[PDB]
Amino acid sequence: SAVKAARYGKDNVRVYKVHKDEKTGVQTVYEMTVCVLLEGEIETSYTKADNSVIVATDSIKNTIYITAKQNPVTPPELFGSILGTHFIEKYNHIHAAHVNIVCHRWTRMDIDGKPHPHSFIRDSEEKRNVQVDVVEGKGIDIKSSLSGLTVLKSTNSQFWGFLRDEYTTLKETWDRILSTDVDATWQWKNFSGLQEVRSHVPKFDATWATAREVTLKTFAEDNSASVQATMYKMAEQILARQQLIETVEYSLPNKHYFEIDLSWHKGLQNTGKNAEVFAPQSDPNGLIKCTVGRS
Amino acid sequence: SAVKAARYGKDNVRVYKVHKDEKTGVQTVYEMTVCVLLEGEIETSYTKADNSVIVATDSIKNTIYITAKQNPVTPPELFGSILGTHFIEKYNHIHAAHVNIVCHRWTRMDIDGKPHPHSFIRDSEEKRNVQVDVVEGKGIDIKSSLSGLTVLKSTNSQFWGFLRDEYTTLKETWDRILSTDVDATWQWKNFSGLQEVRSHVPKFDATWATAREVTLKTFAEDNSASVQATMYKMAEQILARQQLIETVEYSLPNKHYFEIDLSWHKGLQNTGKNAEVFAPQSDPNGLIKCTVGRS
Amino acid sequence: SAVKAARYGKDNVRVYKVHKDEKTGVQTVYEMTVCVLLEGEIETSYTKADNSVIVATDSIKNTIYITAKQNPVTPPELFGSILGTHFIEKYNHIHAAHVNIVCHRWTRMDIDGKPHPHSFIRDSEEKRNVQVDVVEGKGIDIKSSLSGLTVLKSTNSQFWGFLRDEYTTLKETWDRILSTDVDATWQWKNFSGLQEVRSHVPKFDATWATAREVTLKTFAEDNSASVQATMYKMAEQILARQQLIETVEYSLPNKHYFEIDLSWHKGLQNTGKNAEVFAPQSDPNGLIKCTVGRS
Amino acid sequence: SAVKAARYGKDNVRVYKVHKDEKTGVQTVYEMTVCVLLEGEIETSYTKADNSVIVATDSIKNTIYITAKQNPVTPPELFGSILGTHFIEKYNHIHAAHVNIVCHRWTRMDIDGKPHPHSFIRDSEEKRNVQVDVVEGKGIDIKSSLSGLTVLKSTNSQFWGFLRDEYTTLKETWDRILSTDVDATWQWKNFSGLQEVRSHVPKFDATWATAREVTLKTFAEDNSASVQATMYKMAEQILARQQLIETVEYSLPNKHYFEIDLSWHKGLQNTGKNAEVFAPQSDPNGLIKCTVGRS
Ligand SMILES: O=c1[nH]c(=O)c2nn[nH]c2[nH]1
Ligand SMILES: O=c1[nH]c(=O)c2nn[nH]c2[nH]1
Numbered sequence A, B, C, D: 001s002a003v004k005a006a007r008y009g010k011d012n013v014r015v016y017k018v019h020k021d022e023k024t025g026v027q028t029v030y031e032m033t034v035c036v037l038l039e040g041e042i043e044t045s046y047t048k049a050d051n052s053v054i055v056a057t058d059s060i061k062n063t064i065y066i067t068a069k070q071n072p073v074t075p076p077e078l079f080g081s082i083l084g085t086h087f088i089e090k091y092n093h094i095h096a097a098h099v100n101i102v103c104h105r106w107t108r109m110d111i112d113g114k115p116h117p118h119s120f121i122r123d124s125e126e127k128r129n130v131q132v133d134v135v136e137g138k139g140i141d142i143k144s145s146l147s148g149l150t151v152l153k154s155t156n157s158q159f160w161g162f163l164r165d166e167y168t169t170l171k172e173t174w175d176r177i178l179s180t181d182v183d184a185t186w187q188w189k190n191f192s193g194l195q196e197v198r199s200h201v202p203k204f205d206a207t208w209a210t211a212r213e214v215t216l217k218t219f220a221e222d223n224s225a226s227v228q229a230t231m232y233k234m235a236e237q238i239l240a241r242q243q244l245i246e247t248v249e250y251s252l253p254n255k256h257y258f259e260i261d262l263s264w265h266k267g268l269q270n271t272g273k274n275a276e277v278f279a280p281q282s283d284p285n286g287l288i289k290c291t292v293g294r295s
């Protein structure tokens, strides 16, 4: 037997950082969960019990805190690149670092119509994520994402003209509820190293904001022919607005809301044009994916 | 042996309702999860296998949908009272109905600075809840709540002057992070029946909004001496603003963020006035409760 | 305004303890999650910011560890009573302690048909719980429970003869699937204090085992007329076998498995006597409760 | 822009099947959650709103039920292969099916030392999974796994001799607790189609049982030098026992239990050889992966 692949590290490292402006008194908080996995010349720890090649996962945890202390933690694409680069430069036998970061929302509170200097609310479980792969001699690959954005529209969704055969019971419809949890990932062109990532720093927050805006607007405005058709429109627009993105991937559950026929009870009309009360279905759900790239 | 207490019903009934304004084209959605448990002269179903006394839980589910079809579902205090009253009036041998409702957020989307007519976002897992107990000959008892409101302030919290003995290691502090998930419940004076609940309908949404506003403002502005002292201030203000509330209960976890001493590494200073990077603790947590009523 | 009720403490305190037999080499592990809430003369911490009355929740956490170090942690009824008694005896102004303990399963592994001395498996998320209320001058009230015991029988359950009216669609049945998650609680007669709890120590594990055995056997063997009728039989038997129990409470979800009519597809027969493939329903669910006591 | 990759289907389809032996009266139940995603010539549904290429996800759900009705559902490797093959053979323009199956435990109850004919218990949340990729003209690729197997040993784990630098605080140890949740995957050699999968049917259950046995035994008996070294031993043995497996992958969290220094309290000794009470840590955790293949 032989080791074909190996990676190891620390998962679920929760980190909070506060920035205090001494002038204005304004404080800004960041909270993240971080995972760092390393690869390199470490096969002997598995095969020969040679621990001398292991940077202890506890040390990886320490490194995340120290790096957060000495560097900006925003945008997460930059923090992840700094963190990954550290391990490949510091340890001769480590040749790749894989850094995943989940950013949690702490939104400044508005009290009496003015922004509060040091009080925050978690408005939704929506996350902003990054995956950063730093590979010695191959640069830095960054995938940025938003996840956990849950939306619903109550009309202006249709689904008709699909394949009908002996397995089909679904009725065609020209007016349905559409609801989904959005997972959208944009993959950056490969960067040569930290200097290049630093040179593009302003684009990271701007592209996240654009991806979010395009997703929300397209969903709200498209008279949707299917989840497939609407999601493609979103991806197309993101690629048009940021030339440094190579691909856009969406993964979308179709969370079904079923009509309830109440006609058995006193002829009550609750279907088609008369539908008012629906039953949300926890499962099963449609799952629709697509990756869109450039011609 | 004897049956001392018994209740039975249907839990986790998910309900969505849409309202369509034919004039403006504006649609508004409501989504809830409902539980209804009944009590009454049903002991024989347990002791003698006499199913003739059982209103099937499947029928309870049907009733929730039918009631939602024929009545407003907002405010939830009114819907719960209608639903509970139905069972005690319809079935001679049922003498109490217990209705719990969890309302999920569907917030209208703003697209290009204007409210969209039929598109919604789930902004946070904060819930608005009601518990309604309808007891034949004893009226309607309603407890209203908000839950899952998660907040953090990065300064203006202190904790000193607590009891110190041989079990104590905690250091006194004049500047700490305070973060909690707010669960706040206000209990209404007993109502004689549906007519009286209907007469107070405008107060339900207004009091929920007030409870939310008072909680957020007090948390943000109080230079907190403890969770205990800050929560009391919140409860006091709610009781002052709505005379029809008899008691206010808060249950608050104290979600700890620990300093990380980094001085072992190159004398790095990250404690006290120099603290920037903290470790959020998933567990354990403080849990602080209080029920405040009128003199 | 006035404080009507107040309690505070530490939740989610995870504790592991190991016992090492120096003779046999056998090790036995216990793992629990503990919550301790205190009550007493503490109103001033809420109303006057008087922290001098507060035993810090951090100290409560320390106390749980120290108490686990110096005392047996099994049976949990005894550990909870020791822990609760500590606070009311140690602090003059604390008059009640409420201790909740969840015991997690670590079952000794059998390797090659023999019990391993120091290796364990988590066989199921079933828990054994206790709630202990220690109230100065009123003794010790203990509720013991099992929860998270998930069972299913594929036949020998019926449900017919229930009330039928204009809200009813459910068909009567003489053969259905019955599946539930068992939550069963037995409440002990009040104990005068620790000496009395200590005198009954052997009964705690034995009664837990009996409650478990009676639940499983009755479920498997009863040709069930309803959840109500089967659960009553369980409770009756537990009360008969342990005279020191005053009441038995069961809370049981009815987790539905629906037939799937496939007759639309090539006349395929999958209902009634021909039913083979079913759709488990995540929600809604029936919820059936009963508390049984002595004549 | 262009579609680079696309797949779509139905997730979270819960399925139960019962087998009734008319002779013995014995019933056996199977419960699974199934996901099926399809790929093929479907780009136009995304780019041109051409729904004529879409097999509706609702039809995919119907197909899973019908296939379960007409075929054995065990072993899951066979069921998944039947299900995947159906879609690529039935629909000309569908060229790949990806089938994931999670099998839930329903273990026959022993009542009074004998196996009950129709009553079952969920003993643990351990799952048996399969991933089956059926690709037109490329055969059937099957990955089998077990997950959610949670174990702990209280001694006979060590960790010393790791890299020490200015980021390191971890002390070397010769006696620690080791606890993990096991995720183990074995990848079968590619099969040419259903006939070949059918010919190997007896190997699937046997190899699952062997993988489980080897994991448990090795964990219990190895005087572990690290998670890395112990996991390699497991993988090596599985590859030796089943020649039709090409690779074995393990992914193992290292769930930490920390010593608690109690010496501040009356000189209480609870560290090193005196350690009895530990604090389980919910996060962070080590994460250790390896893929082992043949020379
Ligand atoms: O078994 C271990 N492997 C590791 O890589 C490690 N790092 N810290 N502790 C550890 N334990
Ligand atoms: O056992 C049952 N009890 C009930 O109360 C009920 N209601 N619907 N189905 C049911 N099954």
Ligand SMILES: O=c1[nH]c(=O)c2nn[nH]c2[nH]1
Pocket (backbone or CB within 6 Å): B159, B170, B225, B226, B227, B228, B254, B286, C008, C054, C055, C056, C057, C058
């Ligand atoms: O606000 C607080 N209240 C308390 O009771 C407490 N105990 N430890 N820390 C604390 N903080």
Ligand SMILES: O=c1[nH]c(=O)c2nn[nH]c2[nH]1
Pocket (backbone or CB within 6 Å): A159, A170, A225, A226, A227, A228, A254, A286, D008, D054, D055, D056, D057, D058
């Ligand atoms: O938008 C949809 N896409 C699909 O593929 C599908 N299948 N059933 N319903 C559906 N709705």
Ligand code: NA
Pocket (backbone or CB within 6 Å): A087, A088, A089, A090, A091, A092, A093, A094, A095, A136
């Ligand atoms: Na390197």
Ligand code: NA
Pocket (backbone or CB within 6 Å): B087, B088, B089, B090, B091, B092, B093, B094, B095, B136
């Ligand atoms: Na009545």
Ligand code: NA
Pocket (backbone or CB within 6 Å): C087, C088, C089, C090, C091, C092, C093, C094, C095, C136
């Ligand atoms: Na006392």
Ligand code: NA
Pocket (backbone or CB within 6 Å): D087, D088, D089, D090, D091, D092, D093, D094, D095, D136
């Ligand atoms: Na095909």
Ligand SMILES: [Xe]
Pocket (backbone or CB within 6 Å): A015, A016, A017, A030, A031, A032, A068, A073
């Ligand atoms: Xe952070």
Ligand SMILES: [Xe]
Pocket (backbone or CB within 6 Å): B015, B016, B017, B030, B031, B032, B068, B073
């Ligand atoms: Xe609703």
Ligand SMILES: [Xe]
Pocket (backbone or CB within 6 Å): C015, C016, C017, C030, C031, C032, C068, C073
């Ligand atoms: Xe414990």
Ligand SMILES: [Xe]
Pocket (backbone or CB within 6 Å): D015, D016, D017, D030, D031, D032, D068, D073
């Ligand atoms: Xe199944």
